[PDB]
PDB file of C-alpha atoms and ligand atoms in Angstrom:
ATOM      1  CA  UNK F   1     125.807  79.252  -9.401  1.00 46.28           C
ATOM      2  CA  UNK F   2     129.669  78.519  -9.866  1.00 42.31           C
ATOM      3  CA  UNK F   3     130.266  80.271 -13.596  1.00 44.28           C
ATOM      4  CA  UNK F   4     128.485  83.146 -11.410  1.00 45.80           C
ATOM      5  CA  UNK F   5     131.195  83.050  -8.725  1.00 46.18           C
ATOM      6  CA  UNK F   6     133.859  82.441 -11.016  1.00 48.75           C
ATOM      7  CA  UNK F   7     132.217  85.828 -12.748  1.00 48.43           C
ATOM      8  CA  UNK F   8     132.164  88.041  -9.543  1.00 49.14           C
ATOM      9  CA  UNK F   9     135.499  87.007  -8.558  1.00 49.46           C
ATOM     10  CA  UNK F  10     137.141  87.989 -12.041  1.00 51.28           C
ATOM     11  CA  UNK F  11     134.796  91.448 -11.892  1.00 52.22           C
ATOM     12  CA  UNK F  12     135.947  92.117  -8.379  1.00 51.30           C
ATOM     13  CA  UNK F  13     139.715  91.596  -9.448  1.00 50.01           C
ATOM     14  CA  UNK F  14     139.459  93.160 -12.663  1.00 51.29           C
ATOM     15  CA  UNK F  15     141.326  90.213 -14.464  1.00 49.61           C
ATOM     16  CA  UNK F  16     138.970  90.098 -17.876  1.00 49.10           C
ATOM     17  CA  UNK F  17     142.367  90.993 -19.848  1.00 47.29           C
ATOM     18  CA  UNK F  18     144.420  88.308 -18.022  1.00 48.27           C
ATOM     19  CA  UNK F  19     141.798  85.651 -18.617  1.00 51.31           C
ATOM     20  CA  UNK F  20     141.246  86.440 -22.250  1.00 52.70           C
ATOM     21  CA  UNK F  21     145.133  86.731 -23.004  1.00 52.94           C
ATOM     22  CA  UNK F  22     145.390  83.121 -21.445  1.00 52.03           C
ATOM     23  CA  UNK F  23     142.654  82.074 -23.817  1.00 53.84           C
ATOM     24  CA  UNK F  24     144.683  83.367 -26.908  1.00 55.76           C
ATOM     25  CA  UNK F  25     148.018  81.504 -25.240  1.00 57.05           C
ATOM     26  CA  UNK F  26     146.499  78.417 -25.450  1.00 58.62           C
ATOM     27  CA  UNK F  27     144.677  78.404 -28.706  1.00 58.27           C
ATOM     28  CA  UNK F  28     145.329  75.947 -31.446  1.00 56.70           C
ATOM     29  CA  UNK F  29     147.471  76.792 -34.581  1.00 55.23           C
ATOM     30  CA  UNK F  30     146.522  74.765 -37.607  1.00 56.71           C
ATOM     31  CA  UNK F  31     147.753  75.373 -41.100  1.00 57.05           C
ATOM     32  CA  UNK F  32     145.594  77.529 -43.349  1.00 56.98           C
ATOM     33  CA  UNK F  33     147.450  77.306 -46.758  1.00 53.68           C
ATOM     34  CA  UNK F  34     144.551  77.411 -49.280  1.00 54.32           C
ATOM     35  CA  UNK F  35     143.507  80.750 -47.625  1.00 54.31           C
ATOM     36  CA  UNK F  36     146.518  82.109 -48.466  1.00 51.51           C
ATOM     37  CA  UNK F  37     147.067  81.213 -52.262  1.00 52.05           C
ATOM     38  CA  UNK F  38     147.493  84.157 -54.595  1.00 51.34           C
ATOM     39  CA  UNK F  39     144.423  83.244 -56.435  1.00 53.97           C
ATOM     40  CA  UNK F  40     142.018  83.904 -53.344  1.00 54.95           C
ATOM     41  CA  UNK F  41     143.440  87.163 -52.200  1.00 57.36           C
ATOM     42  CA  UNK F  42     140.031  88.881 -53.452  1.00 57.64           C
ATOM     43  CA  UNK F  43     137.946  86.180 -51.247  1.00 58.95           C
ATOM     44  CA  UNK F  44     139.212  87.073 -48.106  1.00 53.73           C
ATOM     45  CA  UNK F  45     137.804  90.245 -46.321  1.00 57.09           C
ATOM     46  CA  UNK F  46     140.465  90.378 -43.604  1.00 57.93           C
ATOM     47  CA  UNK F  47     144.539  89.342 -43.962  1.00 56.52           C
ATOM     48  CA  UNK F  48     144.724  88.000 -40.513  1.00 58.60           C
ATOM     49  CA  UNK F  49     141.271  85.808 -40.555  1.00 58.02           C
ATOM     50  CA  UNK F  50     141.542  82.559 -42.401  1.00 61.20           C
ATOM     51  CA  UNK F  51     139.973  79.257 -42.157  1.00 59.62           C
ATOM     52  CA  UNK F  52     141.969  76.294 -41.040  1.00 59.47           C
ATOM     53  CA  UNK F  53     142.549  73.778 -44.038  1.00 61.87           C
ATOM     54  CA  UNK F  54     141.226  70.711 -41.816  1.00 58.65           C
ATOM     55  CA  UNK F  55     137.651  72.414 -41.080  1.00 57.53           C
ATOM     56  CA  UNK F  56     137.131  74.802 -44.330  1.00 57.73           C
ATOM     57  CA  UNK F  57     133.855  74.400 -46.101  1.00 56.24           C
ATOM     58  CA  UNK F  58     134.626  73.400 -49.949  1.00 55.18           C
ATOM     59  CA  UNK F  59     132.347  74.605 -52.516  1.00 53.71           C
ATOM     60  CA  UNK F  60     131.559  71.792 -55.012  1.00 52.86           C
ATOM     61  CA  UNK F  61     132.925  73.327 -58.023  1.00 51.71           C
ATOM     62  CA  UNK F  62     136.377  72.111 -60.065  1.00 53.78           C
ATOM     63  CA  UNK F  63     137.647  75.602 -60.759  1.00 52.56           C
ATOM     64  CA  UNK F  64     138.022  76.941 -57.314  1.00 49.80           C
ATOM     65  CA  UNK F  65     136.706  75.453 -54.073  1.00 50.33           C
ATOM     66  CA  UNK F  66     137.667  78.156 -51.779  1.00 49.09           C
ATOM     67  CA  UNK F  67     135.225  80.149 -49.490  1.00 50.22           C
ATOM     68  CA  UNK F  68     136.362  82.096 -46.076  1.00 48.54           C
ATOM     69  CA  UNK F  69     134.084  79.673 -43.873  1.00 50.37           C
ATOM     70  CA  UNK F  70     134.674  76.820 -41.502  1.00 50.12           C
ATOM     71  CA  UNK F  71     132.684  74.001 -39.919  1.00 51.06           C
ATOM     72  CA  UNK F  72     132.350  74.273 -35.849  1.00 48.29           C
ATOM     73  CA  UNK F  73     131.315  70.559 -35.193  1.00 49.29           C
ATOM     74  CA  UNK F  74     130.339  69.931 -31.278  1.00 48.38           C
ATOM     75  CA  UNK F  75     130.446  66.540 -30.531  1.00 49.85           C
ATOM     76  CA  UNK F  76     129.170  66.270 -27.093  1.00 49.04           C
ATOM     77  CA  UNK F  77     126.102  69.049 -27.488  1.00 50.47           C
ATOM     78  CA  UNK F  78     125.307  67.302 -30.888  1.00 53.20           C
ATOM     79  CA  UNK F  79     125.275  70.774 -32.629  1.00 52.46           C
ATOM     80  CA  UNK F  80     127.232  71.708 -35.973  1.00 50.23           C
ATOM     81  CA  UNK F  81     127.857  75.657 -36.861  1.00 50.19           C
ATOM     82  CA  UNK F  82     129.216  77.360 -40.138  1.00 48.52           C
ATOM     83  CA  UNK F  83     130.868  80.402 -39.173  1.00 51.37           C
ATOM     84  CA  UNK F  84     131.985  82.730 -42.614  1.00 50.29           C
ATOM     85  CA  UNK F  85     132.955  86.612 -42.920  1.00 48.13           C
ATOM     86  CA  UNK F  86     130.355  88.902 -44.327  1.00 46.43           C
ATOM     87  CA  UNK F  87     130.320  88.563 -48.103  1.00 51.27           C
ATOM     88  CA  UNK F  88     132.293  90.490 -50.635  1.00 53.75           C
ATOM     89  CA  UNK F  89     131.096  91.797 -53.645  1.00 54.19           C
ATOM     90  CA  UNK F  90     132.853  89.182 -55.877  1.00 54.84           C
ATOM     91  CA  UNK F  91     131.660  86.157 -53.035  1.00 55.05           C
ATOM     92  CA  UNK F  92     127.881  87.135 -52.835  1.00 55.81           C
ATOM     93  CA  UNK F  93     127.146  84.208 -55.491  1.00 57.11           C
ATOM     94  CA  UNK F  94     129.678  81.860 -53.393  1.00 56.14           C
ATOM     95  CA  UNK F  95     128.011  82.432 -50.139  1.00 54.78           C
ATOM     96  CA  UNK F  96     124.374  81.234 -51.812  1.00 55.29           C
ATOM     97  CA  UNK F  97     126.175  78.458 -53.473  1.00 56.07           C
ATOM     98  CA  UNK F  98     127.257  77.029 -49.980  1.00 54.15           C
ATOM     99  CA  UNK F  99     123.912  77.590 -48.379  1.00 56.25           C
ATOM    100  CA  UNK F 100     122.660  75.417 -51.104  1.00 60.41           C
ATOM    101  CA  UNK F 101     125.093  72.767 -51.089  1.00 60.45           C
ATOM    102  CA  UNK F 102     125.261  72.489 -46.961  1.00 57.54           C
ATOM    103  CA  UNK F 103     121.446  72.429 -47.334  1.00 59.52           C
ATOM    104  CA  UNK F 104     121.277  75.178 -44.348  1.00 57.45           C
ATOM    105  CA  UNK F 105     117.823  76.548 -43.624  1.00 56.42           C
ATOM    106  CA  UNK F 106     118.806  79.461 -41.863  1.00 55.79           C
ATOM    107  CA  UNK F 107     121.443  82.478 -41.877  1.00 56.25           C
ATOM    108  CA  UNK F 108     122.228  84.694 -39.036  1.00 57.23           C
ATOM    109  CA  UNK F 109     123.369  87.691 -39.410  1.00 60.60           C
ATOM    110  CA  UNK F 110     124.967  89.881 -36.589  1.00 59.16           C
ATOM    111  CA  UNK F 111     126.134  93.315 -38.183  1.00 59.49           C
ATOM    112  CA  UNK F 112     124.658  96.137 -40.234  1.00 58.18           C
ATOM    113  CA  UNK F 113     125.582  96.698 -43.596  1.00 55.32           C
ATOM    114  CA  UNK F 114     126.957  99.948 -43.005  1.00 56.15           C
ATOM    115  CA  UNK F 115     128.996 100.502 -39.307  1.00 55.05           C
ATOM    116  CA  UNK F 116     131.273 103.324 -38.246  1.00 52.43           C
ATOM    117  CA  UNK F 117     130.651 105.134 -41.631  1.00 53.12           C
ATOM    118  CA  UNK F 118     132.285 101.887 -43.480  1.00 55.19           C
ATOM    119  CA  UNK F 119     130.927  98.715 -45.207  1.00 53.27           C
ATOM    120  CA  UNK F 120     131.235  95.650 -43.362  1.00 49.56           C
ATOM    121  CA  UNK F 121     129.564  93.619 -46.008  1.00 50.68           C
ATOM    122  CA  UNK F 122     127.824  93.472 -49.252  1.00 49.39           C
ATOM    123  CA  UNK F 123     123.616  93.996 -49.517  1.00 49.46           C
ATOM    124  CA  UNK F 124     123.737  90.094 -50.608  1.00 49.53           C
ATOM    125  CA  UNK F 125     119.792  89.752 -50.000  1.00 50.39           C
ATOM    126  CA  UNK F 126     116.940  91.527 -52.049  1.00 50.18           C
ATOM    127  CA  UNK F 127     115.150  94.571 -50.510  1.00 52.01           C
ATOM    128  CA  UNK F 128     111.973  94.518 -52.370  1.00 52.60           C
ATOM    129  CA  UNK F 129     109.570  91.418 -53.413  1.00 55.26           C
ATOM    130  CA  UNK F 130     109.436  92.579 -56.933  1.00 57.79           C
ATOM    131  CA  UNK F 131     112.924  92.833 -57.512  1.00 58.80           C
ATOM    132  CA  UNK F 132     114.690  89.510 -56.959  1.00 57.21           C
ATOM    133  CA  UNK F 133     118.666  88.568 -57.385  1.00 55.80           C
ATOM    134  CA  UNK F 134     120.491  86.421 -59.942  1.00 56.40           C
ATOM    135  CA  UNK F 135     123.838  85.166 -59.150  1.00 54.41           C
ATOM    136  CA  UNK F 136     125.230  84.252 -62.605  1.00 53.23           C
ATOM    137  CA  UNK F 137     128.465  82.795 -61.345  1.00 52.64           C
ATOM    138  CA  UNK F 138     126.546  80.167 -59.659  1.00 54.44           C
ATOM    139  CA  UNK F 139     123.095  79.880 -61.251  1.00 56.66           C
ATOM    140  CA  UNK F 140     120.801  80.894 -58.530  1.00 55.08           C
ATOM    141  CA  UNK F 141     118.035  83.183 -57.956  1.00 52.81           C
ATOM    142  CA  UNK F 142     117.149  84.730 -54.659  1.00 52.28           C
ATOM    143  CA  UNK F 143     113.788  86.038 -53.938  1.00 53.37           C
ATOM    144  CA  UNK F 144     112.087  88.429 -51.002  1.00 52.79           C
ATOM    145  CA  UNK F 145     109.056  86.524 -49.815  1.00 51.53           C
ATOM    146  CA  UNK F 146     108.113  88.372 -46.653  1.00 53.49           C
ATOM    147  CA  UNK F 147     109.892  90.387 -43.827  1.00 54.98           C
ATOM    148  CA  UNK F 148     108.951  91.053 -40.258  1.00 56.17           C
ATOM    149  CA  UNK F 149     110.539  94.136 -38.702  1.00 59.86           C
ATOM    150  CA  UNK F 150     111.025  94.091 -34.768  1.00 57.69           C
ATOM    151  CA  UNK F 151     112.631  96.415 -32.196  1.00 58.19           C
ATOM    152  CA  UNK F 152     116.050  94.507 -31.915  1.00 60.20           C
ATOM    153  CA  UNK F 153     115.825  92.137 -34.916  1.00 62.59           C
ATOM    154  CA  UNK F 154     114.204  91.564 -38.620  1.00 63.02           C
ATOM    155  CA  UNK F 155     113.215  87.974 -39.569  1.00 66.21           C
ATOM    156  CA  UNK F 156     112.711  87.408 -43.322  1.00 64.59           C
ATOM    157  CA  UNK F 157     111.640  84.581 -45.558  1.00 68.51           C
ATOM    158  CA  UNK F 158     113.222  84.047 -48.508  1.00 66.39           C
ATOM    159  CA  UNK F 159     113.384  81.448 -51.504  1.00 66.36           C
ATOM    160  CA  UNK F 160     116.295  80.025 -53.156  1.00 68.72           C
ATOM    161  CA  UNK F 161     116.119  78.762 -56.494  1.00 69.67           C
ATOM    162  CA  UNK F 162     118.570  76.373 -58.468  1.00 69.97           C
ATOM    163  CA  UNK F 163     118.405  77.476 -61.797  1.00 69.48           C
ATOM    164  CA  UNK F 164     120.193  74.392 -62.881  1.00 70.75           C
ATOM    165  CA  UNK F 165     117.289  72.350 -61.465  1.00 72.85           C
ATOM    166  CA  UNK F 166     114.298  74.601 -61.017  1.00 71.62           C
ATOM    167  CA  UNK F 167     114.357  73.050 -57.172  1.00 68.31           C
ATOM    168  CA  UNK F 168     113.687  75.936 -54.633  1.00 71.98           C
ATOM    169  CA  UNK F 169     114.021  75.792 -50.862  1.00 71.74           C
ATOM    170  CA  UNK F 170     112.829  78.396 -48.140  1.00 72.86           C
ATOM    171  CA  UNK F 171     115.739  80.024 -46.180  1.00 74.65           C
ATOM    172  CA  UNK F 172     115.067  82.151 -43.168  1.00 75.25           C
ATOM    173  CA  UNK F 173     117.233  85.154 -42.724  1.00 77.68           C
ATOM    174  CA  UNK F 174     117.705  86.216 -38.820  1.00 77.95           C
ATOM    175  CA  UNK F 175     119.209  89.681 -38.719  1.00 80.75           C
ATOM    176  CA  UNK F 176     120.087  91.121 -35.136  1.00 82.51           C
ATOM    177  CA  UNK F 177     120.061  94.884 -36.067  1.00 81.41           C
ATOM    178  CA  UNK F 178     121.131  96.739 -32.637  1.00 82.54           C
ATOM    179  CA  UNK F 179     124.451  95.571 -31.645  1.00 80.96           C
ATOM    180  CA  UNK F 180     126.343  98.878 -30.955  1.00 80.92           C
ATOM    181  CA  UNK F 181     129.294 100.326 -33.257  1.00 79.79           C
ATOM    182  CA  UNK F 182     131.425 100.359 -30.108  1.00 78.90           C
ATOM    183  CA  UNK F 183     131.758  97.502 -27.224  1.00 74.24           C
ATOM    184  CA  UNK F 184     129.022  95.036 -26.212  1.00 78.01           C
ATOM    185  CA  UNK F 185     125.144  95.378 -24.960  1.00 78.43           C
ATOM    186  CA  UNK F 186     124.467  96.119 -21.782  1.00 78.80           C
ATOM    187  CA  UNK F 187     122.268  93.402 -20.855  1.00 78.87           C
ATOM    188  CA  UNK F 188     122.204  90.267 -22.613  1.00 76.45           C
ATOM    189  CA  UNK F 189     118.212  89.940 -22.513  1.00 77.23           C
ATOM    190  CA  UNK F 190     117.763  91.049 -26.303  1.00 76.25           C
ATOM    191  CA  UNK F 191     120.480  88.911 -27.334  1.00 76.44           C
ATOM    192  CA  UNK F 192     119.038  85.800 -25.673  1.00 77.43           C
ATOM    193  CA  UNK F 193     115.719  86.527 -26.844  1.00 73.73           C
ATOM    194  CA  UNK F 194     117.101  86.353 -30.428  1.00 72.90           C
ATOM    195  CA  UNK F 195     118.795  83.306 -29.833  1.00 69.89           C
ATOM    196  CA  UNK F 196     115.573  81.683 -28.766  1.00 69.39           C
ATOM    197  CA  UNK F 197     113.868  82.965 -31.971  1.00 69.75           C
ATOM    198  CA  UNK F 198     116.574  81.309 -33.918  1.00 68.30           C
ATOM    199  CA  UNK F 199     116.076  77.924 -32.206  1.00 64.43           C
ATOM    200  CA  UNK F 200     111.986  78.117 -31.988  1.00 62.12           C
ATOM    201  CA  UNK F 201     112.460  78.248 -36.258  1.00 63.38           C
ATOM    202  CA  UNK F 202     114.152  74.803 -36.282  1.00 62.67           C
ATOM    203  CA  UNK F 203     117.247  76.350 -38.108  1.00 62.88           C
ATOM    204  CA  UNK F 204     119.746  74.962 -35.559  1.00 65.05           C
ATOM    205  CA  UNK F 205     118.165  71.364 -35.699  1.00 62.62           C
ATOM    206  CA  UNK F 206     119.603  67.954 -36.772  1.00 59.70           C
ATOM    207  CA  UNK F 207     117.162  67.469 -39.702  1.00 60.58           C
ATOM    208  CA  UNK F 208     118.609  70.566 -41.703  1.00 59.21           C
ATOM    209  CA  UNK F 209     122.289  71.370 -42.461  1.00 57.92           C
ATOM    210  CA  UNK F 210     124.614  73.658 -40.361  1.00 57.71           C
ATOM    211  CA  UNK F 211     122.931  77.179 -39.628  1.00 58.81           C
ATOM    212  CA  UNK F 212     125.073  79.604 -41.344  1.00 60.69           C
ATOM    213  CA  UNK F 213     126.326  82.378 -39.068  1.00 57.40           C
ATOM    214  CA  UNK F 214     128.220  86.064 -39.787  1.00 56.59           C
ATOM    215  CA  UNK F 215     129.201  89.090 -38.722  1.00 58.47           C
ATOM    216  CA  UNK F 216     132.263  91.353 -40.954  1.00 60.10           C
ATOM    217  CA  UNK F 217     134.969  88.646 -39.848  1.00 61.87           C
ATOM    218  CA  UNK F 218     132.885  86.046 -38.622  1.00 60.44           C
ATOM    219  CA  UNK F 219     134.973  85.336 -35.339  1.00 60.58           C
ATOM    220  CA  UNK F 220     133.529  88.051 -32.612  1.00 59.21           C
ATOM    221  CA  UNK F 221     129.843  88.529 -32.485  1.00 58.51           C
ATOM    222  CA  UNK F 222     129.745  84.830 -34.605  1.00 56.41           C
ATOM    223  CA  UNK F 223     131.568  83.637 -31.766  1.00 58.59           C
ATOM    224  CA  UNK F 224     129.359  85.009 -28.935  1.00 63.08           C
ATOM    225  CA  UNK F 225     126.332  83.615 -30.580  1.00 61.41           C
ATOM    226  CA  UNK F 226     127.647  79.900 -31.068  1.00 64.59           C
ATOM    227  CA  UNK F 227     129.301  79.695 -27.610  1.00 65.65           C
ATOM    228  CA  UNK F 228     126.164  80.815 -25.662  1.00 64.36           C
ATOM    229  CA  UNK F 229     124.042  78.430 -27.567  1.00 61.18           C
ATOM    230  CA  UNK F 230     126.530  75.453 -26.771  1.00 61.23           C
ATOM    231  CA  UNK F 231     127.016  76.253 -23.345  1.00 64.07           C
ATOM    232  CA  UNK F 232     123.028  76.192 -22.575  1.00 64.32           C
ATOM    233  CA  UNK F 233     122.517  73.043 -24.422  1.00 65.59           C
ATOM    234  CA  UNK F 234     125.386  71.329 -22.342  1.00 61.75           C
ATOM    235  CA  UNK F 235     123.738  72.537 -19.125  1.00 60.09           C
ATOM    236  CA  UNK F 236     120.456  70.679 -20.247  1.00 60.91           C
ATOM    237  CA  UNK F 237     122.161  67.460 -21.156  1.00 65.60           C
ATOM    238  CA  UNK F 238     124.586  66.584 -18.100  1.00 67.28           C
ATOM    239  CA  UNK F 239     123.812  65.432 -14.693  1.00 65.12           C
ATOM    240  CA  UNK F 240     125.722  68.283 -13.193  1.00 66.47           C
ATOM    241  CA  UNK F 241     125.162  71.676 -14.904  1.00 64.31           C
ATOM    242  CA  UNK F 242     127.818  73.277 -12.568  1.00 63.38           C
ATOM    243  CA  UNK F 243     130.325  71.480 -14.779  1.00 59.14           C
ATOM    244  CA  UNK F 244     129.914  73.606 -17.891  1.00 59.10           C
ATOM    245  CA  UNK F 245     133.341  75.348 -18.453  1.00 61.57           C
ATOM    246  CA  UNK F 246     132.701  78.311 -20.658  1.00 61.01           C
ATOM    247  CA  UNK F 247     136.899  78.863 -21.384  1.00 63.25           C
ATOM    248  CA  UNK F 248     137.088  74.886 -22.066  1.00 63.04           C
ATOM    249  CA  UNK F 249     134.032  75.120 -24.628  1.00 63.74           C
ATOM    250  CA  UNK F 250     135.642  78.235 -26.174  1.00 64.54           C
ATOM    251  CA  UNK F 251     138.930  76.881 -26.627  1.00 66.03           C
ATOM    252  CA  UNK F 252     137.161  73.295 -28.173  1.00 64.75           C
ATOM    253  CA  UNK F 253     135.501  75.681 -30.582  1.00 63.26           C
ATOM    254  CA  UNK F 254     138.679  77.557 -31.709  1.00 64.32           C
ATOM    255  CA  UNK F 255     140.437  73.889 -32.869  1.00 66.58           C
ATOM    256  CA  UNK F 256     137.874  74.815 -35.706  1.00 67.01           C
ATOM    257  CA  UNK F 257     138.076  78.616 -36.393  1.00 67.03           C
ATOM    258  CA  UNK F 258     140.685  80.825 -35.140  1.00 64.99           C
ATOM    259  CA  UNK F 259     140.202  84.171 -33.142  1.00 64.61           C
ATOM    260  CA  UNK F 260     136.675  83.291 -31.703  1.00 67.50           C
ATOM    261  CA  UNK F 261     135.601  86.082 -29.119  1.00 69.15           C
ATOM    262  CA  UNK F 262     137.812  89.222 -30.151  1.00 70.81           C
ATOM    263  CA  UNK F 263     137.769  91.034 -26.749  1.00 70.09           C
ATOM    264  CA  UNK F 264     138.040  90.702 -22.799  1.00 72.15           C
ATOM    265  CA  UNK F 265     134.706  92.592 -23.123  1.00 72.13           C
ATOM    266  CA  UNK F 266     133.199  89.963 -25.546  1.00 71.65           C
ATOM    267  CA  UNK F 267     134.318  87.248 -23.235  1.00 70.98           C
ATOM    268  CA  UNK F 268     132.858  88.921 -20.437  1.00 69.40           C
ATOM    269  CA  UNK F 269     129.364  89.476 -22.224  1.00 68.11           C
ATOM    270  CA  UNK F 270     129.328  85.288 -23.452  1.00 66.89           C
ATOM    271  CA  UNK F 271     129.608  84.774 -19.284  1.00 64.67           C
ATOM    272  CA  UNK F 272     126.347  87.377 -18.633  1.00 63.03           C
ATOM    273  CA  UNK F 273     124.430  85.740 -21.454  1.00 61.89           C
ATOM    274  CA  UNK F 274     125.171  82.097 -20.334  1.00 62.79           C
ATOM    275  CA  UNK F 275     124.454  83.113 -16.495  1.00 64.54           C
ATOM    276  CA  UNK F 276     121.163  85.034 -17.446  1.00 65.35           C
ATOM    277  CA  UNK F 277     120.161  82.373 -20.099  1.00 64.92           C
ATOM    278  CA  UNK F 278     120.473  79.664 -17.073  1.00 65.50           C
ATOM    279  CA  UNK F 279     118.836  81.823 -14.570  1.00 67.57           C
ATOM    280  CA  UNK F 280     115.575  81.840 -16.522  1.00 70.13           C
ATOM    281  CA  UNK F 281     115.515  78.314 -17.775  1.00 69.83           C
ATOM    282  CA  UNK F 282     115.749  77.958 -14.003  1.00 66.22           C
ATOM    283  CA  UNK F 283     112.447  79.415 -13.770  1.00 65.57           C
ATOM    284  CA  UNK F 284     110.499  80.835 -16.916  1.00 65.28           C
TER     285      UNK F 284
HETATM  286  O1  R7T Z 301     126.281  76.164 -11.400  1.00 64.40           O
HETATM  287  C1  R7T Z 301     124.968  76.110 -10.671  1.00 64.40           C
HETATM  288  O2  R7T Z 301     125.234  75.977  -9.406  1.00 64.40           O
HETATM  289  C2  R7T Z 301     124.083  75.341 -11.663  1.00 64.40           C
HETATM  290  C3  R7T Z 301     123.700  76.039 -12.698  1.00 64.40           C
HETATM  291  C4  R7T Z 301     122.593  75.386 -13.672  1.00 64.40           C
HETATM  292  C5  R7T Z 301     121.599  74.806 -12.759  1.00 64.40           C
HETATM  293  C6  R7T Z 301     120.344  74.406 -13.278  1.00 64.40           C
HETATM  294  C7  R7T Z 301     120.043  74.306 -14.831  1.00 64.40           C
HETATM  295  C8  R7T Z 301     120.633  73.378 -16.022  1.00 64.40           C
HETATM  296  C9  R7T Z 301     119.953  73.544 -17.118  1.00 64.40           C
HETATM  297  C10 R7T Z 301     120.016  75.102 -17.669  1.00 64.40           C
HETATM  298  S1  R7T Z 301     120.128  75.753 -15.836  1.00 64.40           S
HETATM  299  C11 R7T Z 301     121.502  74.251 -11.576  1.00 64.40           C
HETATM  300  C12 R7T Z 301     122.997  74.767 -10.508  1.00 64.40           C
END
């Protein structure tokens, strides 16, 4: 396996930091002027993570259409993803407006609400069936329907109601709960299992709007999820699987959102996940 050879060569030479910096150097730079307007300061979690103007998701309202979210459109793989920050106390209603307007079936959450003793995102979904949430600013109601708690992830069924029209939709919430506070998982087995569970739900399929994916900033863990998915889909589709270049797929994705894959360890983990996800598709 070529990617596996490139992998053993970088590991034996200990050059992960050098490969990573080369990607940082070659990555696209596009304007983010809407993100930086003074009216939007409390809509951004991090001053250094903004959506590009060309790929940003627009809210369908005349007041202020801004949300920190990007459309990643992968033309050859035929997959689209929305990558977004963890919602803030004043953007939870905007978040559910986006899910509604973009016709998403699934939300993928890769963080815990508290990590390293600090809040990484708002408690944006209801924890009990009989205590629903109403978002008065966007006119939406959200109800917990069911919850399935497993060792490495939790799946929830949610009902989202547009209070304006009384239409309802079922949203699936896929919550990966065991990413460690520091570094990356030792084995990619539980992350690949989780990826397969999202695929099996229909959430990534072209009959729905794009999947919404987030962590805290929406670039690191979130970047790893869409990079692994896209690379495995391309290996399934092409006559020569050996031709899939993970570094070139990552640079393509960085044309749509800055900073995807935050560390040399996240880059190495993405290689491991793709290599193992291929080894098992080589014989399940
Ligand atoms: O790089 C290789 O040598 C290689 C990679 C993948 C395959 C077979 C696969 C096709 C699709 C997913 S795995 C064969 C050879």
